[PDB]
Design a protein around this ligand. Structure first.
Ligand code: LEU
Ligand code: MG
Ligand code: ZN
Length: 849
C-alpha cells in the first residue's frame, strides 16, 4: 500500500476492475430483485457542467447503495441529442448538427466514465439516431390513426425578417429577437397530441405517487387546472340585439366556478373577438380601437397576470337569470377567445381581479357571501372575500344561508329548470402541439398527397430518416428546401407526394426513453415485452425541478399511451422522485470572467493581466455571467472522488450547492485522511479477521466504539434509503472515525474491532467515493466488496450495559423514570421496611417515604 493518496493512480484501475467485473452491465435476471435508478439524460451540448456531476453522483450513490444490498440495479445513460443547441452551433461553425453532437457525445461519455458512475453503457441510447426515433415515428402513426394525434390549424409567431417561427419567449415586446421586427401571427396546420382526453387520468393518478414530493404533484394539478363549475346563459336585453346574429342575439353564455355568487354579478365581460364586442364596435370607433389594441398583444400566461386589466363599456345589456338585474357588457383584455366561452361574469365583491377592475372603473360590488362576523369594506379587499369554504349566502333572497356546495347545487337547480344553465367540468390544460419548423429533430412521419390527403408512413418504411449532412442557415427550415428529401411517393396510391417537413417537439424523446433503456437494441418495437415485464417502472428518478411540470406530464402521458397500446403495463413511470438543487458560484467582472481564469487572492484580480477585477454576486452557474466551473478542472486537480464527495457533502440534494474552493480542499483532505487511517492501521499489524459475535468481555472502550459503529451503520442506511440526505450520512462516518482515532485499538481484540470499523466505513462510503473505497477495501479484505455487501447492523452492539437504605435493584441504562420507581415498590428489603412521593435518584437511590 502506498503511504500517499494518489487519486490519478487508483481511479482508472478501480474503473477497470468494475468494468472487467461487469457489475453494472445487468440483464433481466430473475435470480435477483430489480432496481431501476434513472437520472435525467443530458443534452450532448459539449461538456459536462457541475449540474450534470451533481445529478449523476446522486443517482450513483443511490444505485451503488442498492447494489450493495444485492439488488439487480440498472442505471442507464444516453443522449437527448435533438434540439436547437446543435442547430445553433451549425450556424456558428458551419458544421452539421449530427457531427457536432456525436463529437460532444464521445467527449461527454469519457467524461462520465471518468467519474466512475456505475452505469450500464451497453444500454446507451442516442435519441438523434434512427434506431431510436424510428419508434416515436411508429407510435405517432399508431396514434394518428386513432385520432389521438391530429392535424389542425394553430397560430404561431412568424418573424418576417428572420423568416422562421419564433417561440413566445423569444419575442420581446411584440417583436422578434435576432431581428426585432413586428411579429406576424399566422395560422398554419400543425400536429397535436390529444392530451386533453387523458386529463382526468393524468390528474387522478397523481394520488398514487405517495413518494413524490407534494409540491411537484401540486404543480402538476395546477397546470392541468381542472375546475367544476357552471355554464350560465344571460338573456341579451331587447334593446341590445342591434347587429347580433343567431344564438348570440339570444344569450351571452359564460363559464364560472362560483355560481354560488351569481346573485352578485354587477357586469359582464367579453373577449375582444366576441360577436357582442364587434356588434357594439360598429358605430363606436373607440371600441374598434380597443379591440385592435387587444388583438395586437401577447398571450403569455406570465404576461397575463402581470398586465394592467383594461376594459371598455359597450352600451349593450344582458339580464341575470336569477335576480333580473340589467348588467352592461364590457369588452375586457383579460377575456381570452378560445378557452370555453368567450366571456365571463364579474362579481367584484368576491373576486380580487373583478374587484380591482370595478374599483378602477367605479363599477358596483354586491356582497353575496358573508364569513361569520367579518366586517366588509367595499373599498378594501380582504382575503375572506373569496372564501369558498367558510361562507354562506347573503343578499341572495331565497338562497340566503346555504354554504358553497349547497348553493352550488341549488343554482344549478334553478338554472336547469329555466334551461339557462348546466354544470360543466373544464381544464386549463390545452392540447400538445408537437410540430417544429426546425431541422435537427425527429421527422414527422406524414406524407401529403393531393389525392389521399395527409397519410402516415407505413410501419415497414420507418424510419423516415433525417439527413445528417445539413448545415442549417437559420433563414428557414432546410427540410422545406431539400427536394431530395420532401419529394416522395404516396404510400396509398403511388403518385407524386411531398413529405411533412416539420420535425417533432424534442420533448417526444424524453417522454419514453426510460422504457427504451429496457431494450435499447430491440428492433421489433419501442420496448420488448420481455424486458418491460422485468423492469416494470423506474423505481427512482433524479432530475432538476425545471422539469417538474411539462417533462413529467409528457412522460406520464406517453406511459399511459404506451400502456393503452399494450407495450407496457404500468400506469405511472416514476415511483420515487428526487429533485436536485441547483449549483451556484460567484461571478466576476460589463465583462464576465470565468473563475478558473481569475486570481482571487480579501480582494481579487485577473489570472493573466493581474489588474483588479470585480468580485460580483453569487448565482446559478450559467453562460450569461460566465461562472460555470468546468468539472474537468476539478477532476484533473483533485480526482473524481473529491468531486463526488464535495457535492454530496456541501449541501443536501434538494438545496442549492455553493461552489467553494475550501470545500473541495476539505473533501480531498478527508479522502487523504481516510487513506492514511487504513495505511497507519495496516502498517502496525496487517489485516486480521474483523471482530464479530458476542462482545461480552470487550473493554468498555471497545464496546462503545462497536456501539458507535453499528449506530453509524443504521444512520447511514437510513440516510441513504429513506431520507436521501447524503451530507449527514458522510458526517456520521466522520464521527465514527473520530471516535476510532480516540480509541486505543492496540490489543488483539482492539485490532479486531478496528478491522470491523474500517471494513464498515469503506463500505459505507463506497456509494459516494467508490474509487478510494474499492482500493482501501482490497487492502483490508480479500473478498469482492460487492459480494460482502452492505454492512449489517449488529443489534447486540446497540444494547448498552445496565446500571433506611432498604436494598438495591438493577434496571436498564435506557430505562424509564417509572421503570426504576416500579422496581423500588417491589424490592424485598423495601416491603420488609414498609409495612404496606418516591424520591428516585437515577444512578443512586430510589427512596420511598
Ligand atoms: C429528461 C430530459 C428532458 C432532460 C434534458 N435532456 C436535460 O438535459 O435537461
Ligand atoms: Mg402503492
Ligand atoms: Zn396518394
Amino acid at each position: 500500500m502506498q503511504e500517499h493518496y494518489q487519486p490519478a493512480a487508483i481511479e482508472p484501475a478501480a474503473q477497470k476492475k468494475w468494468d472487467d467485473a461487469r457489475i453494472s452491465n445487468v440483464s433481466e435476471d430473475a435470480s435477483k430483485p430489480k432496481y431501476y435508478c434513472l437520472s435525467m439524460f443530458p443534452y450532448p451540448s459539449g461538456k459536462l457542467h457541475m449540474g450534470h456531476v451533481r445529478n449523476y453522483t446522486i443517482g450513483d450513490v443511490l444505485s451503488r447503495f442498492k447494489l450493495l444490498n444485492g439488488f439487480n440495479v440498472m442505471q442507464p445513460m444516453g443522449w437527448d441529442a435533438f434540439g436547437m443547441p446543435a442547430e445553433n452551433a451549425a450556424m456558428k461553425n458551419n458544421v452539421a448538427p449530427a457531427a457536432w453532437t456525436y463529437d460532444n457525445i464521445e467527449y461527454m461519455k469519457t467524461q462520465l466514465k471518468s467519474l466512475g458512475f456505475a452505469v450500464d453503457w451497453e444500454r446507451e441510447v442516442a435519441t438523434c439516431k434512427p434506431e431510436y426515433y424510428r419508434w416515436e415515428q411508429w407510435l405517432f402513426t399508431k396514434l394518428f390513426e386513432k385520432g389521438i394525434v391530429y392535424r389542425k390549424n394553430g397560430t404561431v409567431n412568424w418573424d418576417p425578417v428572420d423568416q422562421t417561427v419564433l417561440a413566445n419567449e423569444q419575442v420581446i415586446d411584440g417583436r422578434g429577437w435576432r431581428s426585432g421586427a413586428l411579429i406576424e401571427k399566422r395560422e398554419i396546420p400543425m400536429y397535436y397530441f390529444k392530451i386533453t382526453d387523458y386529463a382526468e387520468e393524468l390528474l387522478n393518478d397523481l394520488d398514487k405517487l405517495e413518494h413524490w414530493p407534494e409540491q411537484v404533484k401540486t404543480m402538476q394539478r395546477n397546470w392541468i387546472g381542472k375546475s367544476r363549475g357552471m355554464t350560465v346563459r344571460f338573456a341579451v336585453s331587447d334593446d341590445s340585439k342591434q347587429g347580433l346574429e343567431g344564438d348570440y342575439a339570444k344569450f351571452l353564455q359564460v363559464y364560472t366556478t362560483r355560481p354560488d355568487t351569481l346573485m352578485g354579478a354587477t357586469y359582464v365581460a367579453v373577449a375582444a373577438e366576441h360577436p357582442l364586442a364587434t356588434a357594439a364596435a360598429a358605430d363606436k370607433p373607440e371600441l374598434q380601437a380597443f379591440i385592435a389594441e387587444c388583438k395586437a398583444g401577447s398571450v403569455a400566461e406570465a404576461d397575463m397576470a402581470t398586465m394592467e386589466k383594461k376594459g371598455v363599456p359597450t352600451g349593450r345589456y344582458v339580464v341575470n337569470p336569477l335576480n333580473g338585474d340589467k348588467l352592461e357588457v364590457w369588452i375586457a383584455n383579460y377575456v381570452l377567445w378560445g378557452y370555453g366561452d368567450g366571456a365571463v361574469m364579474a362579481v367584484p365583491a368576491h373576486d380580487e381581479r373583478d374587484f380591482e377592475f370595478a374599483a378602477k372603473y367605479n363599477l358596483p360590488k354586491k356582497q353575496v357571501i358573508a364569513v361569520g362576523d367579518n366586517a366588509f369594506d367595499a373599498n378594501r379587499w380582504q382575503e375572506w372575500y373569496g372564501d369558498k369554504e367558510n361562507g354562506v349566502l347573503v343578499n341572495s333572497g331565497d338562497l340566503d344561508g346555504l354554504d358553497f356546495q349547497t348553493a352550488f347545487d341549488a343554482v344549478a337547480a334553478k338554472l336547469q329548470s329555466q334551461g339557462a344553465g348546466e354544470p360543466k367540468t373544464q381544464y386549463r390544460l390545452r392540447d400538445w402541439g408537437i410540430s417544429r419548423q426546425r431541422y435537427w429533430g425527429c421527422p414527422i412521419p406524414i406524407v401529403h398527397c393531393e389525392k389521399c390527403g395527409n397519410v402516415p408512413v407505413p410501419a415497414d418504411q420507418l424510419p423516415v430518416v433525417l439527413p445528417e449532412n445539413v448545415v442549417p442557415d437559420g433563414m428557414g427550415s432546410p427540410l422545406a428546401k431539400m427536394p431530395e428529401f420532401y419529394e416522395t411517393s404516396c404510400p396509398c396510391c403511388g403518385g407524386a407526394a411531398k413529405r411533412e417537413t416539420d420535425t417533432m417537439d424534442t420533448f417526444i424523446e424524453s417522454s419514453w426513453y426510460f422504457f427504451r433503456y429496457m431494450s435499447p437494441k430491440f428492433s421489433d418495437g419501442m420496448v420488448s415485452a420481455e424486458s418491460a415485464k422485468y423492469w416494470g417502472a423506474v423505481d427512482q428518478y433524479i432530475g432538476g425541478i425545471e422539469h417538474a411540470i411539462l417533462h413529467l406530464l409528457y412522460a406520464r402521458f406517453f406511459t399511459k399511451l404506451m400502456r393503452d397500446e399494450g407495450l407496457v403495463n404500468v400506469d405511472e413511470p416514476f415511483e420515487r422522485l428526487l429533485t436536485q438543487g441547483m449549483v451556484v458560484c460567484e461571478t466576476y467582472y460589463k465583462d464576465w470572467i470565468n473563475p478558473a481564469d481569475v486570481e482571487l487572492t480579501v480582494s481579487a484580480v485577473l489570472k493573466a493581466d493581474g489588474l483588479p477585477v470585480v468580485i460580483s454576486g453569487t448565482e446559478k452557474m450559467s453562460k450569461s455571467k460566465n461562472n460555470g466551473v468546468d468539472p474537468q478542472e476539478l477532476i484533473n486537480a483533485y480526482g473524481a472522488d473529491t468531486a463526488r464527495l464535495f457535492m454530496m457533502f456541501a449541501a443536501p440534494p434538494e438545496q442549492s450547492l455553493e461552489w467553494s474552493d475550501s470545500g473541495v480542499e476539505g473533501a480531498h483532505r478527508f479522502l487523504r485522511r481516510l487513506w492514511r487511517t487504513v495505511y497507519e492501521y495496516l502498517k502496525q499489524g496487517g489485516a486480521v479477521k474483523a471482530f464479530a459475535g458476542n462482545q461480552d468481555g470487550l473493554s468498555k472502550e471497545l464496546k462503545d466504539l462497536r456501539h458507535k459503529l453499528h449506530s453509524t451503520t443504521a444512520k447511514v442506511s437510513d440516510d441513504y434509503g429513506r431520507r436521501q440526505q447524503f451530507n449527514t450520512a458522510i458526517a456520521a462516518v466522520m464521527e465514527l472515525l473520530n471516535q476510532y482515532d480516540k480509541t486505543d485499538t492496540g490489543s488483539e481484540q482492539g485490532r479486531a474491532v478496528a478491522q470491523e470499523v474500517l471494513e464498515a466505513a469503506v463500505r459505507l462510503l463506497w456509494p459516494i467515493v467508490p474509487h478510494i473505497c474499492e482500493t482501501l477495501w482490497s487492502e483490508l479484505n480479500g473478498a469482492k466488496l460487492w459480494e460482502a455487501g452492505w454492512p449489517t447492523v449488529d443489534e447486540a452492539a446497540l444494547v448498552k450495559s445496565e446500571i433506611k437504605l432498604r436494598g438495591k435493584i438493577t434496571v436498564a441504562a435506557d430505562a424509564s423514570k417509572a421503570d426504576l420507581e416500579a422496581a423500588a415498590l417491589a424490592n424485598e428489603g423495601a416491603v420488609k421496611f414498609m409495612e404496606g412521593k418516591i424520591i428516585v435518584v437515577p444512578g443512586r437511590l430510589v427512596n420511598i417515604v
